[PDB]
Amino acid sequence: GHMANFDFDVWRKKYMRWMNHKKSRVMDFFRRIDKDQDGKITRQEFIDGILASKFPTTKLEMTAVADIFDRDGDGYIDYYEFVAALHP
């Protein structure tokens, strides 16, 4: 039930610098995680995806970022939310 101002600009910059330096495109990541190919991934599928890529981050951080990605709060991170979060 707790909420905080999470430094998402720093997590985001850190993530994009990581991907860009690791020869990966974030949409290959999304499409890879989106197995049903309908343009959605659960907050949990997304978190598990990031942690699985072994990007330096923690579960405590990832509940926060997954919260921020899910801009509507319907439990799913869709394609447009994903892009909007990473590419304002």
Binding site: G1, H2, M3, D72
Partner: protein, 74 residues
């Protein structure tokens, strides 16, 4: 932006039916004082709804007023 806070607040405090209508003062962009006499409280915005800082975490503005504005406090 972020004036959505001061918009939602004034819009919802307008609903007061008291003779001395519930008073709210804005100290900062995210700080408000609520009530006839009172303390400094944080006010942020999550998605569409406004959130006020309470003990166990954060409370929706409507629930906050329901609990602190007497004309709604059943």
């Amino acid at each position: 932006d972020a004036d959505k806070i001061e918009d939602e607040v004034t819009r919802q405090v307008a609903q007061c039916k008291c003779a001395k209508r519930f008073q709210v003062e804005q100290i900062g962009e995210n700080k408000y004082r609520f009530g006839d006499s009172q303390q400094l409280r944080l006010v942020r915005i999550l998605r569409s709804t406004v959130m006020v800082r309470v003990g166990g975490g954060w409370m929706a503005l409507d629930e906050f007023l329901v609990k602190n504005d007497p004309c709604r406090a059943r």
